[PDB]
Design a protein around this nucleic acid. Structure first.
Ligand SMILES: *[PH](O)(O)OCCCOc1cccc2c(OCCCOP(=O)(O)OCCCOc3cccc4c(O)cccc34)cccc12
Ligand SMILES: *[PH](O)(O)OCCCOc1cccc2c(OCCCOP(=O)(O)OCCCOc3cccc4c(O)cccc34)cccc12
Ligand SMILES: *C[C@@](*)(O)[C@H](CCCNC(N)=[NH2+])NC(=O)[C@@H]1CCCN1C(=O)[C@H](N)Cc1ccccc1
Ligand SMILES: *[C@@H]1O[C@H](CO)[C@@H](O[C@@H]2O[C@H](CO)[C@@H](O)[C@H](O)[C@H]2NC(C)=O)[C@H](O)[C@H]1NC(C)=O
Ligand SMILES: [K+]
Ligand SMILES: [K+]
Ligand code: NA
Lengths: 27, 250
DNA sequence: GGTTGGGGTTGG
DNA sequence: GGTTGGTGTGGTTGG
């Protein structure tokens, strides 16, 4: 139920250096 | 991981190292899907053409790690295996069809900043993310070419079926997908030997959670032009995963 | 050096 | 069928 939300990232409202490349690859 | 870069800390907190006891050794990647269950590639455990056959007591898992060989005092947690559940239809003889295994740990792992499970996809998630051109992320401590000191990451686009097919003589099935840049795309990157069992993950733009869509399974060389990495299709095997866990206990 | 390289993702 | 498809009695494996 808590899965896939990272303590250092999503839970802090911080992104990693490369996830934006993933998001942009969608439509 | 070829042509990747060093992971940031707590970027991949579901990453798991399958570690051999004697001689002491890294075998494979794996992923944490709950506090007592780990997912890996079957061929990490059982591959007769190489005379490979590991049992519960031959192995340990190491969770929460970043550095490849240093014991990370106060960060990593090591667990023993209680039971291995290799898919009954795994095919090691032909094409590694259903290259998947579950491992239950002897004790539950306490989550932290550095230890945390990934989500497994449902129908809708699968249908909206597993599409050609969409990029996912592959992680591991495997070979830097055809050995790193910190965990490597690379982002790679899903490739359409006919291109995957035309790229190899190996018989592809619906239990696998392939990923990687095409020759003309310019960017480069691939998984490699030692990375098997590690997750191919995608971040949902709907609920911002990371889902494991794939498991590093096989390839021909590493990062060759016109060749692509192959991945076990996690959603296609989801019914089996839920069946094993529901029956054997979380 | 250590279960371990060169504070740190953690003591001393 | 099964923790598992069907070329369904072995097979990359028991019953
Ligand atoms: P706990 O509180 O019971 O014990 C902790 C106290 C001991 O701390 C250390 C023990 C061993 C090594 C180190 C240490 O090593 C770093 C290696 C790199 O060396 P350097 O480039 O830092 O060399 C600088 C030399 C400075 O020497 C001293 C500085 C201060 C005090 C003393 C001293 O009392 C005796 C001898 C030398 C020095 C780093 C930190 C702590 C410890
Ligand atoms: P261990 O030693 O206990 O195992 C041996 C005894 C149990 O054997 C079997 C039990 C159940 C099924 C089978 C079996 O099934 C094959 C798949 C289905 O094939 P099919 O579509 O042709 O169906 C079978 C048709 C004929 O049915 C029977 C044949 C013989 C006996 C009986 C019977 O006593 C009751 C009902 C039908 C049949 C294959 C082999 C063994 C077993
Ligand atoms: C066990 C894993 O570490 C490893 C992952 C290789 C990833 N390759 C790329 N470029 N993405 N898998 C293997 O080594 C698998 C297991 C056994 C042999 N193997 C292969 O990839 C062969 N190179 C090709 C192959 C042989 C038999 C069946 C399928 C594929
Ligand atoms: C892999 O190794 C295990 C452990 O040796 C084997 O399991 C044994 O062999 C038979 C058939 O499975 C059974 O009697 C027992 O489960 C184990 N017996 C012993 C001697 O421990 C297993 O056979 C091997 N796997 C393969 C596919 O050969
Ligand atoms: K130290
Ligand atoms: K059967
Ligand atoms: Na390639």
């Amino acid at each position: 139920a808590d899965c896939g939300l990272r303590p250092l990232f999503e839970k802090k409202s911080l992104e990693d250096k490369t996830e934006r490349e993933l998001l942009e690859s969608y439509i | 991981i070829v042509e990747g870069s060093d992971a940031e800390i707590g970027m991949s907190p579901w990453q798991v190292m399958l570690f051999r006891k004697s001689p002491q050794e890294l075998l494979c990647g794996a992923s944490l899907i709950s506090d007592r269950w780990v997912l890996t590639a079957a061929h990490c455990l059982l591959y007769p053409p190489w005379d490979k056959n590991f049992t519960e007591n031959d192995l340990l898992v190491r969770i929460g790690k970043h550095s490849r060989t240093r014991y990370e005092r106060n960060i990593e947690k090591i667990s023993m295996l209680e039971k291995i559940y290799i898919h009954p239809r795994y095919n090691w003889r032909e094409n590694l069809d259903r290259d998947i295994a579950l491992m239950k740990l002897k004790k539950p792992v306490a989550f932290s900043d550095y230890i945390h499970p990934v989500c497994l996809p449902d129908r809708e998630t699968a249908a909206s993310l597993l599409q050609a051109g969409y990029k996912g992320r592959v992680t591991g401590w495997g070979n830097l070419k055809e050995q790193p000191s910190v965990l490597q990451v690379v982002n790679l686009p899903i490739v359409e079926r006919p291109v995957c097919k035309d790229s190899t003589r190996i018989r592809i099935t619906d239990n696998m997908f392939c990923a990687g840049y095409k020759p003309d795309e310019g960017k480069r990157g691939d998984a490699c030997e030692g990375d098997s069992g590690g997750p191919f993950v995608m971040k949902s733009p709907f609920n911002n959670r990371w889902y494991q869509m794939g498991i590093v399974s096989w390839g021909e060389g590493c990062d060759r032009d016109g060749k692509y990495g192959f991945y076990t299709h996690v959603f296609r095997l989801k019914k089996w995963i839920q069946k094993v866990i529901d029956q054997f206990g979380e």
